[PDB]
Design a protein around this motif. Structure first.
Motif, mmCIF file in Angstrom:
data_model
loop_
_atom_site.group_PDB
_atom_site.id
_atom_site.type_symbol
_atom_site.label_atom_id
_atom_site.label_comp_id
_atom_site.label_asym_id
_atom_site.label_seq_id
_atom_site.Cartn_x
_atom_site.Cartn_y
_atom_site.Cartn_z
ATOM 1 N N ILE A 1 -48.679 -95.049 58.619
ATOM 2 C CA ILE A 1 -47.506 -94.333 59.113
ATOM 3 C C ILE A 1 -46.901 -93.481 58.007
ATOM 4 N N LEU B 1 -47.999 -89.549 58.071
ATOM 5 C CA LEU B 1 -46.944 -88.573 58.281
ATOM 6 C C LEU B 1 -46.660 -87.764 57.031
ATOM 7 N N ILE C 1 -46.723 -83.891 58.022
ATOM 8 C CA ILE C 1 -45.492 -83.136 57.848
ATOM 9 C C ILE C 1 -45.517 -82.302 56.580
ATOM 10 N N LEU C 2 -46.014 -82.840 55.479
ATOM 11 C CA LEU C 2 -45.808 -82.238 54.177
ATOM 12 C C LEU C 2 -47.088 -81.852 53.464
ATOM 13 N N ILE D 1 -43.442 -100.232 60.526
ATOM 14 C CA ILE D 1 -42.518 -99.148 60.820
ATOM 15 C C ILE D 1 -41.284 -99.249 59.943
ATOM 16 N N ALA E 1 -42.434 -98.207 56.446
ATOM 17 C CA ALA E 1 -42.679 -96.775 56.351
ATOM 18 C C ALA E 1 -41.392 -95.980 56.419
ATOM 19 N N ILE E 2 -40.370 -96.521 57.073
ATOM 20 C CA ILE E 2 -39.049 -95.907 57.051
ATOM 21 C C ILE E 2 -38.445 -96.009 55.664
ATOM 22 N N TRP F 1 -40.174 -93.571 53.462
ATOM 23 C CA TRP F 1 -39.824 -92.201 53.790
ATOM 24 C C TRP F 1 -38.447 -91.852 53.288
ATOM 25 N N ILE F 2 -37.599 -92.847 53.089
ATOM 26 C CA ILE F 2 -36.282 -92.577 52.542
ATOM 27 C C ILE F 2 -36.366 -92.269 51.056
ATOM 28 N N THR G 1 -37.917 -88.740 50.636
ATOM 29 C CA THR G 1 -37.073 -87.645 51.067
ATOM 30 C C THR G 1 -35.897 -87.448 50.124
ATOM 31 N N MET H 1 -36.288 -87.539 46.945
ATOM 32 C CA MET H 1 -36.898 -86.821 45.844
ATOM 33 C C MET H 1 -37.140 -85.361 46.168
ATOM 34 N N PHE H 2 -36.960 -84.960 47.424
ATOM 35 C CA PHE H 2 -37.098 -83.555 47.795
ATOM 36 C C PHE H 2 -35.878 -82.765 47.387
ATOM 37 N N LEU H 3 -34.798 -83.461 47.098
ATOM 38 C CA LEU H 3 -33.562 -82.820 46.743
ATOM 39 C C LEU H 3 -33.684 -82.252 45.335
ATOM 40 N N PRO H 4 -33.041 -81.131 45.051
ATOM 41 C CA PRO H 4 -32.803 -80.788 43.657
ATOM 42 C C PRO H 4 -31.818 -81.788 43.092
ATOM 43 N N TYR I 1 -29.394 -89.837 47.846
ATOM 44 C CA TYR I 1 -29.500 -88.458 48.293
ATOM 45 C C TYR I 1 -28.577 -87.560 47.497
HETATM 46 C C1 LIG Z 1 -36.204 -92.700 60.344
HETATM 47 C C2 LIG Z 1 -36.157 -91.396 59.543
HETATM 48 C C3 LIG Z 1 -35.941 -91.711 58.041
HETATM 49 C C4 LIG Z 1 -36.333 -90.467 57.179
HETATM 50 C C5 LIG Z 1 -35.398 -89.265 57.535
HETATM 51 C C6 LIG Z 1 -35.439 -88.187 56.396
HETATM 52 C C7 LIG Z 1 -34.461 -86.984 56.785
HETATM 53 C C8 LIG Z 1 -34.093 -86.157 55.535
HETATM 54 C C9 LIG Z 1 -34.972 -84.880 55.495
HETATM 55 C C10 LIG Z 1 -34.843 -83.984 54.516
HETATM 56 C C11 LIG Z 1 -33.801 -84.198 53.373
HETATM 57 C C12 LIG Z 1 -33.539 -82.843 52.637
HETATM 58 C C13 LIG Z 1 -34.875 -82.246 52.119
HETATM 59 C C14 LIG Z 1 -34.712 -80.735 51.936
HETATM 60 C C15 LIG Z 1 -33.366 -80.434 51.270
HETATM 61 C C16 LIG Z 1 -33.596 -79.501 50.076
HETATM 62 C C17 LIG Z 1 -34.435 -78.289 50.527
HETATM 63 C C18 LIG Z 1 -35.858 -78.406 49.898
HETATM 64 O O1 LIG Z 1 -35.971 -78.707 48.745
HETATM 65 O O2 LIG Z 1 -37.011 -78.165 50.686
HETATM 66 C C19 LIG Z 1 -37.873 -79.289 50.816
HETATM 67 C C20 LIG Z 1 -38.768 -79.115 52.051
HETATM 68 O O3 LIG Z 1 -39.290 -80.395 52.409
HETATM 69 C C21 LIG Z 1 -38.724 -80.920 53.622
HETATM 70 O O4 LIG Z 1 -38.325 -80.184 54.459
HETATM 71 C C22 LIG Z 1 -38.631 -82.450 53.834
HETATM 72 C C23 LIG Z 1 -38.932 -82.759 55.322
HETATM 73 C C24 LIG Z 1 -38.539 -84.207 55.611
HETATM 74 C C25 LIG Z 1 -39.406 -84.740 56.761
HETATM 75 C C26 LIG Z 1 -39.086 -86.249 56.967
HETATM 76 C C27 LIG Z 1 -40.017 -86.826 58.091
HETATM 77 C C28 LIG Z 1 -39.304 -88.050 58.742
HETATM 78 C C29 LIG Z 1 -40.339 -88.911 59.509
HETATM 79 C C30 LIG Z 1 -39.971 -90.388 59.318
HETATM 80 C C31 LIG Z 1 -40.745 -91.252 60.337
HETATM 81 C C32 LIG Z 1 -40.875 -92.689 59.773
HETATM 82 C C33 LIG Z 1 -40.899 -93.740 60.981
HETATM 83 C C34 LIG Z 1 -42.300 -93.745 61.627
HETATM 84 C C35 LIG Z 1 -42.189 -94.243 63.110
HETATM 85 C C36 LIG Z 1 -43.546 -94.065 63.808
HETATM 86 C C37 LIG Z 1 -38.767 -79.442 49.572
HETATM 87 O O5 LIG Z 1 -40.077 -79.827 49.969
HETATM 88 P P1 LIG Z 1 -41.149 -80.266 48.770
HETATM 89 O O6 LIG Z 1 -42.256 -79.229 48.681
HETATM 90 O O7 LIG Z 1 -41.751 -81.622 49.073
HETATM 91 O O8 LIG Z 1 -40.299 -80.343 47.309
HETATM 92 C C38 LIG Z 1 -40.256 -79.203 46.459
HETATM 93 C C39 LIG Z 1 -39.583 -79.618 45.090
HETATM 94 N N1 LIG Z 1 -38.124 -79.440 45.138
HETATM 95 C C40 LIG Z 1 -37.637 -79.568 46.560
HETATM 96 C C41 LIG Z 1 -37.496 -80.476 44.321
HETATM 97 C C42 LIG Z 1 -37.742 -78.082 44.604
#
Ligand SMILES: CCCCCCCC/C=C\CCCCCCCC(=O)O[C@@H](COC(=O)CCCCCCCCCCCCCCC)COP(=O)([O-])OCC[N+](C)(C)C
Ligand SMILES: CCCCCCCC/C=C\CCCCCCCC(=O)O[C@@H](COC(=O)CCCCCCCCCCCCCCC)COP(=O)([O-])OCC[N+](C)(C)C
Ligand SMILES: CCCCCCCC/C=C\CCCCCCCC(=O)O[C@@H](COC(=O)CCCCCCCCCCCCCCC)COP(=O)([O-])OCC[N+](C)(C)C
Ligand SMILES: CCCCCCCC/C=C\CCCCCCCC(=O)O[C@@H](COC(=O)CCCCCCCCCCCCCCC)COP(=O)([O-])OCC[N+](C)(C)C
Lengths: 804, 48, 49
Positions: free
Chosen positions: A590, A594, A598-599, A650, A653-654, A657-658, A661, A663-666, C24
């Motif tokens: 999972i 994902l 996704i990424l 699940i 994996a949650i 995923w936290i 996610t 670490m995606f932040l600056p 976060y």
């Molecule tokens: C339950 C849910 C919990 C999770 C919710 C999370 C929500 C919060 C979402 C995002 C938080 C904010 C991130 C972006 C904010 C800054 C903008 C940015 O930097 O762009 C980002 C774009 O990368 C993305 O867009 C991340 C996408 C998150 C997808 C999460 C999938 C959840 C599935 C869960 C299913 C599990 C259960 C399975 C059940 C079957 C950067 O991407 P990067 O290339 O990687 O980094 C570059 C480096 N730098 C960014 C440092 C410069």
């Protein structure tokens, strides 16, 4: 040979063949990154299997852990144990160690052995003529000759069961084929997700194949059939420590899940020897002196040693147990037993020149010696017959004593009861078997009134039936739905026959129970085959032992219950590991599924190897941990096993995923100073996964049972290794500072508590068990209808007493 | 995967035909009846 | 023992909320630990037993 057995696991096995064929293809293409991955797995997969079978072999050889005294041409000579040939007679003394399984010829003074060859527990069992002794036992008292049955002995048959079991077979092997498909289904289901999402982002086939290599390593645990099968194979050797030799390994799983134990009275619940009760004697002038009189009336040498009489010689409380009945009495004449008369009498000479006479005989024939010697001649007839009647109401067979001053006048001293008494542990055992979530039904050949007393002595519940009158023989006016209610809720069945024992199992199994029937005889074998675990208690014939599923050598219910507690430990060891290692597959299918979808990234193929290596290190110590057993029976509830594992995957994996996610932040998120996306996610995955073995191992909540130092030492050694990868950035892009590492440690402790929360309020709730199986509460009786029925049994089982 | 968990499930067989589980005897009524046959077929033996 | 677990459950449940929401917003571990010190003081009453 230990180096021989290593390379066997590399070559043999088609799963290994596919990997090492892929290890050639990557090497032939000079794909060295994926070469150390696949060859890292074979060193893992063959490595883990070796330490698993080295663990199994160590316990077997310790289970296989001398001299014997024989006669050759009538000459007493002493030989080492290796020269004993089956089909031979041995000589056995006090303090001797039994070299081979052997059946006693006959005993002048009966013999006791310790069945604690590895345990070292203090208790011993009595051994009489024709009784079967077993090797590595030690004699604590006695002497005699023993005819050896074999060297393959039962332990040697048990060790041969385990070594064969290293191949893999049973019902749980049928379950592993059921589990192993669904994990293969879950690998393909995410491989479809990470191939589709890697086709849309037009990715090279090499990049896609590094993703499917990573998902296969995590996705298919090849360690389950090695660990699950070894757990039983070690468990069958742990059970032969508890004097229980399982005929198949599935007997460990079936004994674990047994819900009703129909235990025959005569061997297990009672001592199978006759003994006397002094508070339940008549109001004769000496209760204490009464027994001394009866010991006079029995000869003390083997020529007159009747089994009834021999019981009386050894009931004395005085320090001279055997001497005090011959102290200065000076027997002049003795009358032996005459079957028409049913009387034995002894005439001894007093110091002051008096010829006193004492008798022993049947209470009817004692009462007829002089019909009017005792006062109140008609009431003394009634009182003794009434107290003989209450002895029959207690089932006690009754024998009387009478006395003469010497002139010829009889004096009716009284009657003392001798009965097969319950074993001293059995009252505690029935209390303990009730705590273990299973019900004990006592099936006995005695009458309903007799066995209602034994129910009272054990605390069983005193709601028993005539087997013939109740039903169980194809007759009766009782509806089959009511006969099944009576059998399901009976506390026993008196006057039971082998045709009925089959019906008790068959009726109970139509209700859905797992029934353990204890069988001794040759006629009990059709019931033992029918019963879900058929037990051949100590002293069973070859037809019972061959038809039983598990064969006991220690008599008593407590040996059956302690092999039941162990079989629940063995099962929960194989069950805690299956729930765990499935949840780690779901966690990472999972999460990494994902992550790719996704990424379009994943954990490095180097780091994914180490996570699968780290999960297998928990297998090395799961064999060694102290084993908590569940109270209620266990059943491989595969819809619940798959609900708990999928939810724990699940939730895991949650949690991963936290972190990712954040670490995606600056500014980093979970990274306080500097860190790697992989080094942190490898650490977080390695921590929350390996601590899941602390959660699943516990029968209740994880805080109930403290883990062993082996498991908590192996899990912490990994958590140190997984941390040092992260701090120093091994196979990762950067170093991760110690302050980010302690953020990942504290976060991963928080998820371990969330998982421990979910797994507890999910493992113990019947609402979740109901939902996963999809089985509603179809047959719940009314609360008023139970009260009507509960008293209906108490009326009927009263009627069955009064039929006499 | 689809064809296996669809060919072998009676839930799918039930849904496609639209035929509900109309005549399922009680579990207690089966036990009453099962012994009724064993009594009657004993009676049929004893008529000689 | 039954009450004391569920309050410990409720402390961890909010500590998961105030650690996640402090990861976060990348907060120093010292600032997060002053938050969990405050939630533990209120969260676990050692005065009940
Ligand atoms: C339950 C849910 C919990 C999770 C919710 C999370 C929500 C919060 C979402 C995002 C938080 C904010 C991130 C972006 C904010 C800054 C903008 C940015 O930097 O762009 C980002 C774009 O990368 C993305 O867009 C991340 C996408 C998150 C997808 C999460 C999938 C959840 C599935 C869960 C299913 C599990 C259960 C399975 C059940 C079957 C950067 O991407 P990067 O290339 O990687 O980094 C570059 C480096 N730098 C960014 C440092 C410069
Ligand atoms: C209860 C059931 C629910 C299921 C959970 C639902 C969670 C999903 C919810 C939300 C995820 C969406 C996150 C939004 C991201 C926005 C920013 C972004 O990067 O978008 C990306 C695309 O985005 C996608 O393609 C998403 C597709 C994922 C769908 C998976 C569902 C499968 C359910 C089965 C469940 C799985 C179980 C597996 C089987 C065991 C951009 O495309 P990119 O160019 O590739 O990105 C950067 C690439 N680069 C970095 C290389 C440059
Ligand atoms: C059941 C669970 C449902 C899950 C719902 C999923 C909803 C999520 C859907 C979409 C999330 C958001 C997508 C758009 C994001 C912004 C687009 C962009 O900025 O550039 C992107 C345009 O490339 C695209 O066009 C992205 C298209 C992705 C759609 C995938 C559908 C998933 C279907 C699943 C069906 C499951 C079926 C299972 C049912 C049996 C390219 O990205 P980039 O330029 O290379 O660099 C990264 C850009 N970024 C960093 C800014 C992000
Ligand atoms: C129970 C479930 C709970 C779900 C909770 C939902 C959590 C969602 C909450 C928050 C999500 C979004 C947070 C916004 C923060 C970013 C602010 C910003 O600056 O914009 C960013 C754009 O952002 C992106 O490029 C894409 C990130 C948004 C995709 C998140 C999908 C969540 C999927 C949820 C899946 C759930 C499925 C679960 C099903 C089981 C900045 O990008 P930029 O402008 O291009 O430049 C950045 C420059 N800089 C780096 C210097 C900054």
């Amino acid at each position: 040979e230990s180096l021989v057995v290593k390379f066997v696991m590399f070559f043999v096995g088609p799963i290994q063949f596919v990997m090492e064929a892929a290890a050639i293809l990557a090497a032939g293409l000079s794909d060295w990154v994926d070469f150390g991955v696949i060859c890292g797995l074979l060193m893992l997969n063959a490595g883990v299997g070796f330490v698993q079978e080295f663990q199994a072999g160590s316990i077997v050889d310790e289970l296989k852990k001398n001299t014997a005294v024989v006669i050759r041409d009538g000459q007493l000579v002493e030989i080492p144990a290796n020269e004993v040939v089956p089909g031979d007679i041995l000589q056995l003394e006090d303090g001797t160690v039994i070299p081979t399984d052997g059946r006693i010829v006959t005993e002048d003074c009966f013999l006791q052995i310790d069945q604690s060859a590895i345990t070292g527990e203090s208790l011993a069992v009595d051994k009489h003529y024709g009784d079967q002794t077993f090797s590595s036992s030690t004699v604590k008292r006695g002497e005699g000759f023993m005819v050896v049955t074999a060297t393959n002995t039962f332990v040697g048959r048990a060790a041969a069961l385990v070594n064969k079991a290293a191949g893999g077979q049973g019902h749980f092997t049928e379950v592993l084929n059921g589990i192993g498909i669904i994990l293969l289904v879950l690998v393909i289901a995410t491989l479809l997700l990470v191939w589709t999402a890697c086709f849309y982002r037009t990715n090279g086939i090499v990049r896609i194949l590094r993703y499917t290599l990573g998902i296969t390593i995590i996705g298919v645990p090849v360690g389950l059939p090695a660990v699950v099968t070894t757990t039983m194979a070690v468990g069958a050797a742990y059970l032969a420590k508890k004097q229980a030799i399982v005929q198949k390994l599935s007997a460990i799983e079936s004994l674990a899940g047994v819900e009703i134990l129909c235990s025959d009275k005569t061997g297990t619940l009672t001592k199978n020897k006759l003994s006397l009760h002094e508070p339940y004697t008549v109001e004769g002038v000496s209760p204490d002196d009464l027994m001394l009189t009866a010991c006079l009336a029995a000869s003390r040498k083997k020529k007159g040693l009747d089994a009834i009489d021999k019981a009386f010689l050894k009931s004395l409380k005085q320090y001279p147990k055997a001497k005090d009945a011959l102290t200065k009495y000076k027997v002049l004449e003795f009358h032996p037993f005459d079957p028409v008369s049913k009387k034995v009498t002894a005439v001894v000479e007093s110091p002051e020149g008096e010829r006193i006479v004492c008798v022993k005989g049947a209470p009817l024939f004692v009462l007829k010696t002089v019909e009017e010697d005792h006062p109140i001649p008609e009431d003394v007839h009634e009182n003794y017959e009434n107290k003989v009647a209450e002895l029959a109401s207690r089932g006690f067979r009754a024998l009387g004593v009478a006395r003469k001053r010497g002139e010829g006048h009889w004096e009716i001293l009284g009657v003392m009861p001798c009965m097969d008494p319950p074993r001293d542990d059995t009252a505690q055992t029935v209390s303990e078997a009730r705590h273990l979530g299973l019900r004990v039904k006592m099936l006995t050949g005695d009458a309903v009134g007799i066995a209602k007393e034994t129910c009272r002595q054990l605390g069983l519940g005193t709601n028993i039936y005539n087997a013939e009158r109740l039903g169980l023989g194809g007759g009766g006016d009782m509806p089959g739905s009511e006969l099944a209610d009576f059998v399901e809720n009976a506390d026993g069945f008196a006057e039971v026959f082998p045709q009925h024992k089959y019906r008790v199992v068959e009726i109970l199994q139509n209700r859905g129970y797992l029934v353990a029937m204890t069988g001794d005889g040759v006629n009990d074998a059709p019931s033992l085959k029918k019963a879900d675990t058929g037990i051949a208690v100590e002293g069973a014939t070859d037809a019972a032992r061959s038809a039983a599923d598990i064969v006991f050598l220690a008599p008593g219910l407590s040996a059956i219950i302690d092999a039941l507690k162990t079989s629940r430990q063995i099962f929960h060891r194989m069950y805690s590991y299956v729930v765990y290692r499935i949840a780690l597959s779901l966690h990472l299918e999972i999460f990494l599924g994902l992550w790719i979808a996704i990424l379009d990234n994943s954990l490095d193929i180097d780091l994914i190897v180490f996570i699968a290596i780290f999960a297998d290190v928990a297998t090395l110590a799961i064999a060694y941990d102290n084993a908590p057993y569940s109270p209620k029976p266990v059943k491989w509830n595969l819809p619940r096993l798959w609900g708990m594992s999928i939810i724990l995957g699940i939730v895991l994996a949650i949690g991963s995923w936290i972190t990712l996610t954040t670490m995606f932040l600056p500014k980093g998120g979970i990274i306080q100073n500097f860190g790697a996306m992989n080094g942190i996610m490898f650490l977080q995955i390695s921590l929350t996964e390996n601590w899941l073995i602390f959660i699943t191992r516990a029968a209740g909540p994880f805080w109930s049972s403290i883990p062993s130092w082996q498991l908590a030492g192996a899990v912490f050694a990994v958590d140190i290794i997984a941390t040092m990868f992260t701090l120093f950035g091994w196979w990762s892009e950067n170093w991760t500072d110690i302050v980010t590492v302690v953020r990942v440690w504290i976060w991963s402790i928080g998820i371990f508590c969330v998982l421990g929360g979910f797994y507890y309020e999910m493992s113990t709730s019947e609402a979740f068990d109901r939902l996963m199986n999809g089985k509603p509460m179809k047959e719940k009786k009314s609360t008023r209808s139970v009260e009507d029925f509960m008293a209906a049994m108490q009326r009927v089982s009263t009627q069955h007493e009064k039929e006499t």
